[PDB]
Amino acid sequence: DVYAQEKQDFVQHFSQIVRVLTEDEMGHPEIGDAIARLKEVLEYNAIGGKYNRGLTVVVAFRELVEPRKQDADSLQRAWTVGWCVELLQAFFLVADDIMDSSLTRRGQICWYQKPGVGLDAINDANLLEACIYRLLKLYCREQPYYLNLIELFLQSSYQTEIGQTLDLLTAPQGNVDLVRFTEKRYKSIVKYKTAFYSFYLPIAAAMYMAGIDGEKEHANAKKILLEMGEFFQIQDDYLDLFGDPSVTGKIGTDIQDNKCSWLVVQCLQRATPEQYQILKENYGQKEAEKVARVKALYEELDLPAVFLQYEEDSYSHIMALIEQYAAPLPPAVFLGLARKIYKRRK
Amino acid sequence: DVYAQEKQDFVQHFSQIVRVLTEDEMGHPEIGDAIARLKEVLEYNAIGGKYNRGLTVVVAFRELVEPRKQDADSLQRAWTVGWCVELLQAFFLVADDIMDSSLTRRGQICWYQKPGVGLDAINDANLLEACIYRLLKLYCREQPYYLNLIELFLQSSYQTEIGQTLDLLTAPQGNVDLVRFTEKRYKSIVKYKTAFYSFYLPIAAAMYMAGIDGEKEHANAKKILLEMGEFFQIQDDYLDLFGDPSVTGKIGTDIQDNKCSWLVVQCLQRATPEQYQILKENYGQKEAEKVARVKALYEELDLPAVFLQYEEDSYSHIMALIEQYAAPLPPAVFLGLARKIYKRRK
Numbered sequence A, B: 001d002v003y004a005q006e007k008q009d010f011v012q013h014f015s016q017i018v019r020v021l022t023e024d025e026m027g028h029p030e031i032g033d034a035i036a037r038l039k040e041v042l043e044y045n046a047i048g049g050k051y052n053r054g055l056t057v058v059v060a061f062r063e064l065v066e067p068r069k070q071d072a073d074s075l076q077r078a079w080t081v082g083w084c085v086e087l088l089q090a091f092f093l094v095a096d097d098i099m100d101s102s103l104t105r106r107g108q109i110c111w112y113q114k115p116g117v118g119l120d121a122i123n124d125a126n127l128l129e130a131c132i133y134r135l136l137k138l139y140c141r142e143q144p145y146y147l148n149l150i151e152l153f154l155q156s157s158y159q160t161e162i163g164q165t166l167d168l169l170t171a172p173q174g175n176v177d178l179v180r181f182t183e184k185r186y187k188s189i190v191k192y193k194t195a196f197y198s199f200y201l202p203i204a205a206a207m208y209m210a211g212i213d214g215e216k217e218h219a220n221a222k223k224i225l226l227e228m229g230e231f232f233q234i235q236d237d238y239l240d241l242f243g244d245p246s247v248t249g250k251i252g253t254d255i256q257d258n259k260c261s262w263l264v265v266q267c268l269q270r271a272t273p274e275q276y277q278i279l280k281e282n283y284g285q286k287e288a289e290k291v292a293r294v295k296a297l298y299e300e301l302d303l304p305a306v307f308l309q310y311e312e313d314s315y316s317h318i319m320a321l322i323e324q325y326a327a328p329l330p331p332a333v334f335l336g337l338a339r340k341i342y343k344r345r346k
């Protein structure tokens, strides 16, 4: 609703992002072909999603800055930093689809899967990352929060990259070992790989832009947001298998990639020793027959019902945390982000 | 010689790099497996090269800072920033071997080619990049050049990444078009993909650490260093085909990858219309028969002799530039880096 009114002005700002990014270096006509590839990469990989993360920067900025201090220019910056978060997203997703061997994303073929692209996607991805820091300098170089943002984004990338490492160490291909799929392992992985960049990053960027740079205040917002992140990854693992592809925009790969999913951790807990053997025998394989066998065990142990219940208990718990931790920040900040991910299907 | 005395103290500092990187996050035992993968990635990909780039930071630091201002701590920082350059190197090389489909590097199998690694190399690479900025913060956070270095490294990455894009746009696989292999195209590609990070990055880092942050002074050092970079990439294209693998540490792939090499640009210039057809018919293919056919045309148009002559005329020209541009900086700074790449075989 608040995200709804802000969407239009955000998405439209994307022309300028691409304009400023493909001009400030176009006084060097030599790299023009590269700059054209940039425009192409940007419009394929930063466009077509829900923009939850970038909108959070924008939405939270308004609720934190006093209306007098929301000038045309100060807002411009808010939309740019919001798109910077969206580019971190694009950067990670491009690489991740390669590493996960994904077939679609946001309802189209993955960038590396487009003919003519392939493993060049790698350099495209690193470029998307570089653009974050180009924009920060072009728009915020003179701001007092400028170094805070630079360090926040880098720190955040390091974290989700430590997250990815954990994710991949836990899911060797051809190497099934249900034993390693524990609750602690799951909790660590999602906290690092999703929670920081998807939830702490946007709100904190908006905080720093609003002057709120206090260490306790960030620690407190972080307490709320790492919890929402963990809920958000669990919902994502569920959708991976049980969500509709025409809605999520992607084809799930968690069982095939031998991933430490939430479903798999929940299965191994409710598993009778004979179901354990089914799972131990059908997980992390490309065979469709064997993947359905796994999905059938999940439906048999009623994981879809367990997940729905978790969603409820989780949502009430985030709410408690917001009650305990939101001040001195407007509870509408976290409430808005929480409403946007509650009962999502994409 | 100057690089020789500094080598030992540099390489040994690498234990501490790995120590500080794998401890400051090890107060979080949850990511310990990731931190262990880090140590592994670092010791495979940041070790085994000539350390020209990192040593340049160190060597140039001493010749720019007054001996009184070279304390234990100030030196420590110099070795760290030197290794930060070495990690940018590792970051780019890891990704590049994947994109170029390389088989070896520094005399061992490429990281992505090690069994168990593969396209996970991608996340390993992004991690190496992240470590640069972790170290900058751990060692230089309080220095007055701290933001200068952060911006220099990012700027440098953006550049070599624009360089890579150019490199890859010019060499589509299965898409031979000798027409695009021009001198201007070559000059742009190498300036962006090599010159900035390999030559300007290290010297400028050492300058900023020494207080020399003036814009004209950097512009002037850059004039020298982008020239040495271009010589350095040309030497690299030559070694790619004509150098000994037991020395370079890598197997060349430029003809197969359909690359805009120096040799190929020089060939197309000296090519009789019938040699042009040979080339047009054997370039950018995996067939060994066809790759030798190409190498034979190069030896026939005497490219190895042309290259030797270029090396001489080039070296004299850099020297002129050093004469014109080195001041107020010690000419020994550039002379040392120039001696280290003159007549190199690896």
Ligand SMILES: NCCC(O)(P(=O)(O)O)P(=O)(O)O
Binding pocket: A096, A100, A193, A194, A236, A240, A250
């Ligand atoms: N934000 C991480 C991306 C994923 O959610 P995705 O389903 O690929 O969007 P992963 O399942 O690999 O964690």
Ligand SMILES: NCCC(O)(P(=O)(O)O)P(=O)(O)O
Binding pocket: B096, B100, B193, B194, B236, B240, B250
């Ligand atoms: N510094 C770039 C790396 C190379 O030189 P390398 O031979 O792979 O070291 P490229 O030939 O791809 O430019």
Ligand SMILES: [Mn+2]
Binding pocket: A096, A100, A167
């Ligand atoms: Mn993943």
Ligand SMILES: [Mn+2]
Binding pocket: A096, A097, A100, A102
């Ligand atoms: Mn994925």
Ligand SMILES: [Mn+2]
Binding pocket: A236, A237, A240
């Ligand atoms: Mn997923």
Ligand SMILES: [Mn+2]
Binding pocket: B096, B100, B167
């Ligand atoms: Mn290359």
Ligand SMILES: [Mn+2]
Binding pocket: B096, B097, B100, B102
């Ligand atoms: Mn290469």
Ligand SMILES: [Mn+2]
Binding pocket: B236, B237, B240
């Ligand atoms: Mn090469």
